[PDB]
Design an enzyme around this catalytic site. Structure first.
Site: not given
Ligand SMILES: *[C@@H](O)[C@H](C[C@@H]1CCNC1=O)NC(=O)[C@H](CC(C)C)NC(=O)OCC(C)(C)Sc1ccc(F)cc1
Ligand SMILES: *[C@@H](O)[C@H](C[C@@H]1CCNC1=O)NC(=O)[C@H](CC(C)C)NC(=O)OCC(C)(C)Sc1ccc(F)cc1
Lengths: 302, 302
Positions: A43, A144, A146
């Site tokens: 991603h 950041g 990831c």
């Molecule tokens: C690494 O870039 C990052 C790691 C997280 C950032 C905040 N804490 C972490 O461990 N991952 C992401 O930015 C990731 C990217 C996606 C394309 C998979 N986003 C992600 O999973 O964000 C965390 C959320 C809680 C926003 S997911 C979520 C949960 C419930 C909801 F209603 C919407 C989204």
């Protein structure tokens, strides 16, 4: 009386030299540099306005060898890009001179691995986590992080088993193995996903109970025993994982002189309540310590 | 809901390159190699039949530059030996090429530092501990782990603050700072020593309570407040350390919007019992997380 068990992490010096910063436009994260291959979450190519439902196949085709920026805090030129599952396989013209002997493996629920948290390609901290039955981990990750890698050590060989991808709604985290598959039924999309139930790891709780006997705490031990088949049937209706004995568990049994079936009976009654008593200064069963962890940290057996 | 706090350890790659094996006859342990100086515990010279009441001054005079064996897994020749407190200052003809920018500092009760556990000069694991009020730590050490170094990181500078020396009867551990002084009133002799009482760190518990507010858990927060002077008087008769506010604690207060005095009132009532409720999945107050740990791990503030 302190138990002598702490959250012990493998030395991360070998993995630190394999950390790089991967930038694919407006987003940057961490990558794993082994030989002429750089692994990173897929991603990174995604624009911020398309994080909820990426079309990764189209994004990969839109990319170019020159459009991946790999930097070590030394700048790496990309000569080949490919996708496997939820991971990117970037080829570079320079092989990592500090590449250790390594293998790729998949970690299982109840097993523990070390995590090297990084930001902008610079390692920041390390910790150990146990892969929960719902295929999540209780880590400490932020924006950041990831590309941070989870790994186990077997001698001088490092078995990479985890790359951080996302945080769930309940605050836990999940990632992917190095074959491209995310753990559990999770998909690398910025949407709410159904999370499976979490369960107590019976193997780890038995190890924790054995560590109590190794520290003089054995008030919970009774000669009454519960068979593994009876405990497993009980575990299915009490949010407990089915117990599977290993050689590591047997060593604790042979050292302490307490049968595993005695502890399984104790687990059933300890689940109903500690009745005002404590084990290792805790009023709840702990499944965050593996039988191996008790073996090495207490008796020095690896 | 997972809090997002784990036992986070500093990356140990810099310290790993400074680890050496020091042998002084029938005993071997670990040493810290910085510049042309190798630091190690002073009981390495002691024979096994004289570990209870060593006469270290006589032992040092009995030693010779050639009689210290320093090996890195590279063999180091000793050109100068000296003693400071409970530590040996061995001079070597070769300076460590991987010496990082470092300072020597003394850690205080309630503060946390990273520990690199080693055996035979080879690092085996890392973990973070909080120096308890009785100047002990709840670590995981075994025979041959002496010389393992505790350290803190401030930027690119590593502040060494601990060198493991002994394990107490209660299973805890204590060591010495790099000025030669053991922490607390402990002496490096294989005898039973009186251990001071342990206390809850009020600063760390307030930080833990603040982390609950940062994760949506605020059932314990009430507008009633207890002044720091009143809480400190209460703390003196309840095995609680006197609370001293810091800038780190203030940031948590300003972010959450909850006054510290509100939490001090909560601590007094939470000490009497959680009344069947839980905070961060725990039924007891936690003082193993510093305000800095909550600052970096949750809000990304260092
Ligand atoms: C690494 O870039 C990052 C790691 C997280 C950032 C905040 N804490 C972490 O461990 N991952 C992401 O930015 C990731 C990217 C996606 C394309 C998979 N986003 C992600 O999973 O964000 C965390 C959320 C809680 C926003 S997911 C979520 C949960 C419930 C909801 F209603 C919407 C989204
Ligand atoms: C490092 O060489 C080593 C570290 C310990 C080995 C077992 N666990 C450890 O963390 N330290 C020692 O071997 C140390 C050397 C002395 C000269 C200071 N001995 C020591 O402290 O042994 C631990 C004891 C529990 C034996 S101390 C003790 C406590 C009560 C008692 F009645 C007698 C001795």
């Amino acid at each position: 009386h302190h138990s002598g068990l702490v959250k012990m992490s493998h030395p991360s010096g070998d993995v630190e030299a394999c950390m790089v910063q991967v930038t694919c436009g407006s987003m940057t994260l961490n990558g794993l540099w082994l030989d002429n291959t750089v692994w990173c979450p897929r991603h990174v190519m995604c624009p911020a306005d398309q994080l909820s439902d990426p079309n990764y196949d189209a994004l990969l085709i839109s990319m170019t060898n020159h459009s991946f920026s790999v930097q070590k805090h030394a700048n790496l030129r990309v000569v080949g890009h490919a996708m496997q599952g939820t991971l990117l396989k970037l080829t570079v013209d320079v092989a990592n001179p500090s590449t250790p002997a390594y293998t790729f493996t998949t970690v299982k629920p109840g097993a523990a691995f070390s995590v090297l948290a990084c930001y902008n390609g610079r390692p920041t901290g390390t910790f150990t986590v146990v892969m929960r039955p719902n295929y999540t981990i209780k880590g400490s990750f932020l924006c950041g992080s990831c590309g941070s890698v989870g790994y186990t050590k077997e001698g001088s060989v490092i078995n990479f088993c985890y790359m951080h991808q996302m945080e769930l709604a309940n605050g836990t985290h999940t990632g992917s193995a190095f074959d491209g598959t995310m753990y559990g039924a999770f998909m690398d999309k910025q949407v709410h996903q159904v999370q499976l139930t979490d369960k107590y790891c019976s193997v780890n709780v038995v190890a924790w109970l054995y560590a109590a006997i190794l520290n003089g705490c054995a008030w919970f031990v009774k000669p009454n025993r519960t068979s593994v088949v009876s405990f497993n049937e009980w575990a299915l209706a009490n949010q407990f994982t089915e117990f599977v004995g290993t050689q590591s568990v047997d060593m604790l049994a042979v050292k302490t002189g307490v049968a595993i079936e005695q502890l399984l009976y104790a687990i059933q009654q300890l689940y109903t309540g500690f009745q005002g008593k404590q084990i290792l200064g805790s009023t709840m069963l702990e499944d965050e310590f593996t039988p191996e962890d008790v073996n090495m940290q207490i008796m020095g057996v690896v």
